[model samples]
Target chain A: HMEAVQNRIVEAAERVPGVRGVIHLRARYVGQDIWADMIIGVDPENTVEQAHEICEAVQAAVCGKIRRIESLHVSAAAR
Target chain B: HMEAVQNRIVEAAERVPGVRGVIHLRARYVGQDIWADMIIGVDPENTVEQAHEICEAVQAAVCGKIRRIESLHVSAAAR
Candidate 1:
């Protein structure tokens, strides 16, 4: 379960244009509740707003795959 | 509390050599517990291991400032 979520998240995050890599992916489960977080590395050439859009893309991608997530957080850093 | 932690995290992550930018930072609290996730974009030229080390540095920097963190997840993306 953990591996699947992590893989799905990585896949989703990398699909975004500004994202070049995924550094970490984690999920914490409490009963049926799941809290997921992912960190992605983005293109430094992008404007700050573009970076934010990449994060949103990742968030949407992850949430689309994992419906049970109680919380999904996506963050980005520059390359 | 939230803003302070976020600021500290961004400061620490940006200090890492390979990390050029921070795109998003999110912290969730359940009572006293805090879970943090940050994404960094790294140099596309770096090896994967180097990127991982950058994430570790960010983790160390963030945890140093906020001792109450229950979980700290750092990820890297590329430019």
Candidate 2:
């Protein structure tokens, strides 16, 4: 099978430093735009705030990156 | 409560010798394929990999059931 993707996602992943990894939850690219979700884990050293920074980096790298993302709440627990 | 959902989640904060928190993620089950996203917090005593082992314990305690769990990352977070 042959597939041709915009590869913008890969570029986006590379741009983000806090995004230790990005796994596409849904990969739908068509006439509209690419809609994808990822399981992004950040190193403790980077922290969630850093992850947000990484998102900004990705946005700067790509022109059409969605400004708002739909995601569940992220928090830390106390023991 | 009005209309009922298939299930509702209830949880309490319990500390592991190392784990201090837990996060509920998304899930989708279809045949043998399942997708889940969970965040569980652990302490300094254990490494992130060890924290994953704790999720296993929870699965076992529930029953001979360890459904498809994509991610249940439990790691320490500090201020």
Candidate 3:
């Protein structure tokens, strides 16, 4: 099952007003820890500022979902 | 091109004494933040503790490279 933050982040990114869709989002199970990556396409009208705002929103949503989860990281650019 | 920490983490995870190989690794960039994930296969004899060490190694190595980059999160369960 997916952790709460995992769902929250994906949901937040997807809910962004101009987000097209997530190409792929999955976590890596190494020997012990978890890491994740998500590829997203932004709507043409969405500026970097808007995307940043949505990202922070996702971060807060994720933190609100999971207590012991690590910090958030995201790389968004025009596509 | 990937950021410095991206390369370092991948290289470090790949070089772990018991690491098999990285399945895939890439970053999630939203606005300015960049998040990353790596899929690693550990040597069968490698314990969770060993994997955590390598994970930490990757985290530190990444911090050494990037300044504002957020923390590292690794998910290493079995394959």
Candidate 4:
């Protein structure tokens, strides 16, 4: 169940522009609650201003796909 | 390199009293920076006060062992 959610999150994350890779992903399933965190790498070619939009895009993508996520924390590094 | 640090983190977290399990752990490696986030479960038998201490212990343990961690975010729940 949770595995499927993780897969969807990864897939959704990749669809967003400027995301080079997902460096780290963690999803916690405790009882009926699900929590997720993502650390993604933004392509250096993407400007700093564009990074913010990428973050928003990733958030929208994951949140739209995974409805069970209670806590969604996304961190991005430009590299 | 990062795996070793993660192993050490798990070991240290387990050694801390009242910590039942690590529900989620994310470690991101970006060039010279390392970012980490942990969601821990505290034993229900333990008091809420002890859970806070366990968070502190986990933080100390991981920070002491992994010097390269630029960001350490620890979240805990009593369950």
Candidate 5:
């Protein structure tokens, strides 16, 4: 069940533009809601602000699609 | 300035109930807003839900006091 949820989250994040991939993904249930954290990869040349924007976009994309998430923390890195 | 902000964040988090310490704290500026990620230590005896609640409390404590923060990611672990 957790595995399926994780996969769905990854798919949602990858569908966003400027997101290269998701790494170090972790998710756990706290009662009925899920808490998760992950680093999303973007173009190495992207500026800090650009990368940050991508991270925000991924956060919105995932949380907007996955209603079970209590909180999703997304970090961005060059890859 | 960055050092001062980091120190303030650490102080705020440590004051929270059930939070042992903050570790691996990293903060960066994306434009004018600050983005940070850190691991927070809690009692090993805490249940998953309890630990999760502590994390959320820390997040609130820091973000509530630090208006410059755009996003803060707090992860809880047993010390």
Candidate 6:
């Protein structure tokens, strides 16, 4: 059940523009709510601010698609 | 100007409930907006889910108080 949700999160995040890849994804349940952490890859030339914007987009995309997510901590890394 | 904003971010995050401390705070300019990353310390007994909640609160508090923040990537650590 939880594994399926994690796959859905990855899919949602990967759909965002400027996302090169998603890595280190982890999800856990606390009662009925889900908490997740992942690092998203972006272009190496992207500024920290630009990378951050991608990260924010990934977070929004994941949470908007997956209603059970209580929190999604998304970090950006240059690839 | 940037240093002052960093201090304000720390103060805002520290005020959140269940946050033990904020460390490794870094902020940089991407045009007129600021991008920040930091790790928030939480109690060791707190589950990953609980710590993530505290991280979310800190993110909200800092962003709500600091309008120039384009993105704040907060991570939780057990202290």
lDDT at residue A68 of model 4 (Cα atoms): 78
Cα RMSD to the true fold for all candidates: 8.8, 8.0, 17.5, 14.2, 16.0, 15.6
Give the better candidate number (2 or 3) by DockQ. Answer: 2
Give TM-scores of the second chain, every candidate.
0.86, 0.40, 0.61, 0.80, 0.97, 0.96
DockQ score of the complex predicted as candidate 1: 0.07
TM-score of each: 0.50, 0.41, 0.39, 0.47, 0.52, 0.52
lDDT of 1 at A32: 76
Task: Return the DockQ of model 3.
Answer: 0.02
lDDT of 6 at B55: 81
TM-score result, candidate 5:
0.52
Each model's C-alpha lDDT? Answer: 0.76, 0.41, 0.57, 0.75, 0.85, 0.83
Global fold similarity of model 1 (TM-score):
0.50
- Which is better, 4 or 6, measured by DockQ? 6
After TM-score superposition, what is the CA distance of residue A15 in candidate 1 from its true location, in Å? 1.6
Candidate 1 segments whose C-alpha is farther than 4 A from its true place = B1-79
Better of 1 and 6 by lDDT: 6
> Which candidate has the top score in DockQ?
2
Off by over 4 Å in 5: B1-79
DockQ (Cα-based) per candidate?
Answer: 0.07, 0.10, 0.02, 0.03, 0.03, 0.03
The CAPRI classification for model 2 reads as: incorrect
Question: lDDT per residue, candidate 3, B1-79, as tens digits?
Answer: 4566567667766655545666667776665666777656654344445655555665665556655456456543333
Tens-place lDDT digits, model 1, residues B14-70: 877778899777888877878988888876566556666788988887788778888
Q: List the residue pairs that clash in candidate 4.
A: none
Worst 10 residues of 2 chain A by lDDT: A70-79
Candidate 6 pairs with clashing backbones: none
Global CA lDDT computed for model 4:
0.75
